[PDB]
RNA sequence: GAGGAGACAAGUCGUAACAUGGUAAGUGUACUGGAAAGUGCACUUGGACGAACC
RNA sequence: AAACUCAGUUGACACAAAAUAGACUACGAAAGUGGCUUUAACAUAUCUGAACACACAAUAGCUAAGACCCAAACUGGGAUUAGAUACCCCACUAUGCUUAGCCCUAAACCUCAACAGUUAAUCAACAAAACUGCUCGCCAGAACACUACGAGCCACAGCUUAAAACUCAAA
């Protein structure tokens, strides 16, 4: 890394800086004073202060990226979000007044809830042994499972936006091959339950 | 009085009562924690059988039997079987140092039954019946 | 004695180099190689102060007497 | 008190046959040995049983799954706390010993 | 007649010993086996058990 | 995997072995001796001394008669392997125990002889510091060789004693 170890990662959060001094604790005051003497890495070209920045969606776009085609990855992500929103609006209009209360229409909420539903609780590690999964690994496994399922060859000629929107809605409703894969992981963990003692941590 | 770990003296004016029953009256839970298998049998104050369980009966096969999980499953099964017989408080009398020695009690508790005493009864020959020759691996 | 209670290696080195050694030897010390061993306590501040004072006084007396004798003779 | 070593070893002038046969000399070293190096299993079993009885559907297992996650977090936190708290240690004890070495020889 | 030993000397089958030699090694004794050898009972350290608590 | 339909509680129940004490260091010449009670009993001297005799000698083993819980060579099966006449699993026999005789071997080693004495001026290395007096036993390169022949022995695929030829410069 061209950055010397002294450089510190940038904190991009307007609220953190607009916070009044009075609300700050002594530890927080000391941290703010110290940061005035430290070097700060240049803000990456990916994340900004836009209120429409969703780190989960940014990470999903990065994962979907192929060969540094960030433009195409972003295009696919926005197309998927638009397709999800349009399907939700169509269902909302086609639905009765009662079901319109239930029918969600926010693509960001749909995406977050779908990935959360696809997050696996217990993993398997060679030691195979059932084991707890850290939160970062859970999120990455959810995202990778979603992307791999969308990239599966079983879908013929269907475009990635449509495929991913359909899979995302299925996951949001707790259905689809992604949830099936999570259930399969859980079932294998249950089957190897007896081997849980092999784990030394 | 501060707790006394010793069991109540037989045939004595002991105050302790579990559901109004004396210690000699509380039923017994014989647990045999063999090296590869664990067995649990619940009997009455008059040694009348009440329930039975084991790793094999719960369904674990071969090496899987000699595991804490199988022991806990057997304990749960035995506790469930005894609950229908009305056993609440039990005196655990465990013999053997198998992996299920403690998981048997844990499953016997998760099945609902309460334990009032633990009594190790592993057969320790002062000396006799020469055991099998040592294994060279 | 060094700080692990073995004899100070300087004792052996001085014996090798033929440098006379005066030395305060305690009961647990090895006095064989010390040219002039002074058997006495060596762990108490009072004893150490007495030794330092005595040696300083002897050295100062010797030097002042040397200068006095040199002046006395050279005056002749 | 330490067990008596008088007359235990095989030595000249010892009429009795040896009582101890130390493969290594019974002389204190100047060092001590280094500190020699499955939790949440019950929670895993509980959650797996709930999955078994609910067809591995989170709808009812929510509670057991939350308990499993909390137990895993607690295990990780305890690991961190033990690791930080571990740093008398063998290093300090050996440093202390070296200042007072065993002397099996004569000065 | 045949056996034994030693030597010369290459192959052959194995790897028994030398490291915890991959089943620690060996003594006596008995059975067994292509072959070093395997095992049984007792004995030795001519092995270790890391040398505070853990 | 093979294997048994037998497994658990409780009661009755040995001719097998003898937790803890034992972190004790004792008894015996050695081998050996660590459940309890009793009987008998633990040589002598104020030295050493036996293939030159007598008496013992772990474990294993032989003959005969009993016992047989458990263990267990061998044997069979299961598994393993390239093969596995083994290591791992199961069953079982001789055998381990008792009686009466044999056999007389152990790394029978504490590899350090008995008795007396010393710590003084040291000591190849390692090991369990170095020695003095006295007596007996034993050794004189390696291998051949715990072998051959002879001899003795309740021993008969044995034990004790025990060479030589050939070979080497090493061991
Ligand atoms: Mg001093
Ligand atoms: Mg080998
Ligand atoms: Mg070996
Ligand atoms: Mg052997
Ligand atoms: Mg065999
Ligand atoms: Mg012996
Ligand atoms: Mg005599
Ligand atoms: Mg003799
Ligand atoms: Mg004999
Ligand atoms: Mg038999
Ligand atoms: Mg022999
Ligand atoms: Mg012979
Ligand atoms: Mg002959």
State the Cα–Cα distance between residues D26 and D36, nearest whole angstrom: 23
* DSSP letter (8 states) at residue A21: T
* DSSP letter (8 states) at residue A40: B
- Burial label for A197, CB within 10 Å (0-12, 13-18, 19+), is middle
CB contact set of A141 (below 8 Å; sequence gap of 6+): A119, A120, A123, A133
Q: After which residues is chain A broken (C to N over 2.5 A)?
A: 127
Provide, for chain D, the percentages of residues in helix, strand and coil under a 3-state DSSP scheme, each rounded to the nearest 5. Answer: 45, 0, 55
Instruction: Indicate left, alpha or beta for A157 from its phi (over 0: left) and psi (-120 to 50: alpha).
Output: left
Contacts B–D by Cβ distance under 8 A: 5
Compute the half-sphere exposure of residue A140: CA atoms within 13 Å on the CB side of its CA. 6
Interface contact flag, A197 B70, Cβ < 8 Å: no
Q: Which residues of D63-81 are buried (b: 16+ CB within 10 A; e: fewer)?
A: ebbebbbebbeebeeeeee
- Burial label for D55, CB within 10 Å (0-12, 13-18, 19+), is exposed
Angle between helix A107-118 and A135-151 (nearest 10): 110
Q: How far is D94 from chain C (nearest CA, A)?
A: 14
Question: By what technique were these coordinates determined?
Answer: cryo-EM
Residue of B nearest to D42 (CA): B69
String of DSSP letters for chain B: -----SPPPTTS-----BTTB-TTTS-EEEEEE-SS-EEEEEE-TT--EEEEEEHHHHT--GGGGSSHHHHHHHHHHHHHHHHHHT--EEEEEEES--TTHHHHHHHHHHTT-EEEEE-------SS-S--PPPP--
The total domain count for chain B is: 1
D47 backbone dihedrals φ, ψ, rounded to 5°: -65, -40
| Dihedral sign from CA coordinates of A30, A34, A36, A41 | negative
- In D, which residues are within 8 Å of A193 by CB distance? 44-45, 48
The Å distance, Cα A75 to ligand 11 centre, comes to: 93
In sequence order, the β-bridge partners of residue B52 are B41
Does C4 lie at the interface with D, CB-CB under 8 angstroms? yes
Residue B118 Cα distances to A35, A77, B13, B102, B115, angstroms: 60, 62, 22, 11, 8
A9 backbone dihedrals φ, ψ, rounded to 5°: -65, 145
Domain that holds residue B114: 1-137
Q: How far is B36 from chain A (nearest CA, A)?
A: 14
State the Cα–Cα distance between residues B23 and B2, nearest whole angstrom: 18
| Dihedral sign from CA coordinates of A141, A146, A151, A153 | positive
């Amino acid at each position: 890394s061209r950055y010397s170890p002294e450089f510190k990662d940038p904190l991009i959060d307007k609220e953190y800086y607009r916070k009044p001094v009075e609300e700050l604790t002594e530890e927080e005051k000391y941290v703010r004073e110290l940061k005035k003497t430290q070097l700060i890495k240049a803000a990456p070209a990916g994340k900004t202060s836009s209120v429409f920045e969703d780190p989960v969606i940014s990470k999903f776009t990065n994962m979907m990226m192929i060969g540094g085609n960030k433009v195409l990855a972003r295009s696919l992500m926005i197309q998927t979000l638009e397709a999800v929103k349009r399907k939700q609006f169509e269902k909302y209009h086609a639905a009765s007044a009662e079901e319109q209360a239930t029918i969600e229409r926010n693509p960001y909420t749909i995406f977050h809830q779908a990935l959360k539903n696809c997050e696996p609780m217990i993993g398997l590690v060679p030691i195979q042994v059932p084991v707890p999964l850290p939160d970062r690994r859970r999120r990455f496994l959810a995202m990778k499972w979603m992307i791999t399922e969308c990239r599966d060859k079983k879908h013929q000629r269907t475009l990635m936006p449509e495929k991913l929107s359909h899979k995302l809605l299925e996951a949001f409703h707790n259905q689809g091959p992604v949830i099936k894969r999570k259930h399969d992981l859980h079932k294998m963990a249950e089957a190897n339950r007896a081997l849980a003692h092999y784990r030394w941590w | 009085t501060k707790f006394s770990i010793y069991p109540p003296i037989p045939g004595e004016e002991s105050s302790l009562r579990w559901a109004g029953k004396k210690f000699e009256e509380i039923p017994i839970a014989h647990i045999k924690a063999s090296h590869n298998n664990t067995q649990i049998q619940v009997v009455s104050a008059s040694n009348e059988p009440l329930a039975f369980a084991s790793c094999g009966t719960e369904g674990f096969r071969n090496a899987k039997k000699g595991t804490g999980i199988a022991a806990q499953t057997a304990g749960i099964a035995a506790a469930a079987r005894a609950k229908q017989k009305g056993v609440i408080h039990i005196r655990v009398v465990v013999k053997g140092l198998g992996p299920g020695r403690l998981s048997a009690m844990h499953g016997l508790i998760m099945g609902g039954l309460e334990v009032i005493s633990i009594t190790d009864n592993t057969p320790i020959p002062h000396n006799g019946c020469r055991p099998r020759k040592a294994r060279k691996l | 004695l060094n700080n692990i209670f073995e004899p100070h290696v300087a004792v052996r080195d001085a014996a090798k180099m033929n440098i006379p050694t005066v030395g305060i030897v305690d009961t647990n010390c090895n006095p064989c190689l010390i040219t002039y061993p002074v058997p006495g306590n060596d762990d108490s501040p009072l004893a150490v102060h007495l030794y330092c004072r005595l040696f300083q006084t002897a050295i100062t007396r010797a030097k002042e007497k040397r200068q006095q004798v040199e002046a006395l003779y050279r005056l002749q | 008190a330490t067990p008596s070593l008088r007359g235990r070893l095989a030595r000249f002038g010892n009429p009795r046959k040896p009582v101890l046969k130390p493969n290594k000399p019974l002389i204190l070293a100047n060092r001590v040995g280094e500190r020699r190096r499955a939790t949440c299993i019950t929670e895993m079993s509980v959650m797996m049983a709930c999955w078994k009885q609910n067809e591995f559907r989170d709808d009812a297992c929510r509670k057991e799954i939350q308990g499993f996650l909390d137990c895993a977090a607690r295990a990780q936190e305890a690991r961190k706390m033990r690791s930080i708290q571990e740093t008398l240690l063998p290093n300090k004890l050996n440093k202390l010993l070296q200042r007072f070495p065993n002397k099996p020889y004569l000065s």
